[PDB]
Assembly symmetry: none
Homo-oligomer: 222 residues x 2
């Protein structure tokens, strides 16, 4: 069904993270891997797929490897023409990511793109609202998350180079049925931030209808 909302004791405290928050910020303040109608050119293990997505922008990679939480997901998009959108890392890996794959055919939106509203709450107060878009009928939650966080960094300093103005923060997605789930936007405690480990949250390749999804960002101020 759906995931129970977070308890304050269930959320990571940014104040307890002592590393450089800029390592998390760089995963969302910027450009994301993007591929249109591509086909996998190989794979390493039964849980991933490699796509010939070159970086025309900064020339940081000539291909990308994405990982899924199951062999089924990889088998599924193995020989399909797909679209890719997500946050990549180099740390442990050419550049990798997780999930971010949707079937290209029949998924292209014609005409007006859907307006997905993001309601931002600070200490339970709807303080800001903005819309994001997509060109996909069925879009990965990752693409929506990425686009939302980018705006949150640019407009609300969600992540700063050192730490964050917010103690806790989670992004909640609600589908038409009322079913919801959320992601912790803050890093685990300690001085080290493992990017390859954090982005693993996107490996379920979860997708939703772009015209039937609501987003809520809940933050607590320091």
């Amino acid at each position: 069904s759906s995931q129970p909302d977070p308890t304050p004791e269930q959320l990571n405290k940014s104040s307890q993270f002592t590393g450089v928050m800029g390592n998390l910020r760089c995963l969302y303040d910027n450009h994301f891997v993007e591929g249109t109608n591509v086909r996998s050119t190989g794979q390493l293990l039964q849980h991933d797929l490699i796509f010939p997505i070159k970086d025309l922008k900064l020339k940081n990679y000539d291909s990308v490897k994405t990982e899924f939480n199951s062999k089924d997901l990889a088998t599924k998009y193995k020989n399909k023409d797909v679209d890719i959108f997500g946050s990549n890392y180099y740390y442990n890996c050419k550049t990798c990511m997780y999930g971010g794959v949707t079937e290209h055919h029949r998924n292209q939106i014609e005409g007006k793109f859907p307006n997905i509203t993001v309601k931002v709450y600070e200490d339970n107060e709807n303080i800001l609202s903005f819309d994001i878009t997509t060109n996909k009928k069925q879009v990965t939650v990752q693409e929506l998350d990425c686009k939302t966080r980018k705006i949150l960094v640019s407009r609300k300093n969600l992540y700063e180079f050192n730490n964050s103005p917010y103690e806790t923060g989670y992004i909640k997605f609600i589908e038409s049925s009322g079913d919801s789930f959320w992601y912790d936007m803050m890093p685990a405690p300690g001085a080290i931030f493992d990017q390859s480990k954090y982005l693993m949250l996107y490996n379920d390749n979860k997708t939703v209808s772009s015209s039937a999804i609501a987003i809520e960002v809940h933050l607590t101020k320091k």
Copy 2:
């Protein structure tokens, strides 16, 4: 008599076409040239005819030149009042816009009352999963007009052609006349990165026509 149905190997594979499928899509997704009771105003060679059909909609052309696979066809409609319906192109049309066939005599061909319902059966991997009807106002209608109308719906409803490529690997449209005689057209582009519109539309240059009240259409596609 009739054309043998296509073998899998006789059909173009969209996956082998690397250009922009949108160049083929644009030939069947919007408007088609249409003229009612017009008369040719000239011609360049012996197997074409120019008609004073103006683009009232988008103002993209003041006349149209259509080509046939023979001089006889051009001579036949040269001085007759005709109706025109077809898919036009603008890349390598000198005499504006060009086309192939699409001509039927206007007089005695106008349908009075209820227009015929031409059923289109759509098959995906040999499974009839969808059927829809198209119509026309002509007793004897060109198969170009029927093809055009069918593909337009297929693009709008089944994403037959997308901007990049297509959800279907192979695809052909088959026409069957009352006698059982049939023929088909390959709906997929030739392999490679280039799509020649003027070359593709040549399939309509025989100006083939059929009875609108005695024709069946079948679309056979294979999924990717």
